[PDB]
Amino acid sequence: GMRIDLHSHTTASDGRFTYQQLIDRAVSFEIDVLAITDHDTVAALADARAYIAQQQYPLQLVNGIEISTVWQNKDIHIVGLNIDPNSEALGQLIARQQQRRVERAELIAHRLQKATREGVLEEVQHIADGAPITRAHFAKWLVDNGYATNMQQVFKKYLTRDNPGYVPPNWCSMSEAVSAIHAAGGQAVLAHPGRYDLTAKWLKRLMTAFVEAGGDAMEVAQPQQSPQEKRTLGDYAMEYQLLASQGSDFHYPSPWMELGRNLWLPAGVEPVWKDWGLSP
Applying CB under 5 A, the residues found at the interface with Mg ion are 14, 77, 136
Segment interacting with Mn ion (CB under 5 A) among 64-72, 104-112, 199-207, 252-260: 64-72
> Minimum Å distance from CB 80 to Mn ion?
12
**Residue at shortest CB range from Mn ion:** 249
CB closer to Mg ion out of 5 and 14: 14
Q: With contact defined as beta carbons under 8 Å apart, do 51 and 22 qualify? A: no
5 touches Mn ion (CB under 5 A): no
> Minimum Å distance from CB 3 to Mg ion?
22
What are residue 192's phi and psi, to 5 degrees? 30, 65
CA distances (Å), origin 44, targets 12, 30, 60, 65, 132: 6, 21, 15, 10, 13
> Minimum Å distance from CB 136 to Mg ion?
5
Give the DSSP letter of residue 77: E
Chain positions 196 to 255 lying near Mn ion, rule: CB under 5 A, are 249
CB closer to Mn ion out of 32 and 249: 249
Q: With contact defined as beta carbons under 8 Å apart, do 64 and 272 qualify? A: no
Distance CA 58, CA 123 (A): 39
176 touches Mn ion (CB under 5 A): no
CB closer to Mn ion out of 79 and 167: 79
> Minimum Å distance from CB 81 to Mg ion?
14
Distance CA 17, CA 152 (A): 20
What are residue 128's phi and psi, to 5 degrees? -70, -25
- Residue numbers of the site for Mn ion (CB under 5 A)? 66, 249
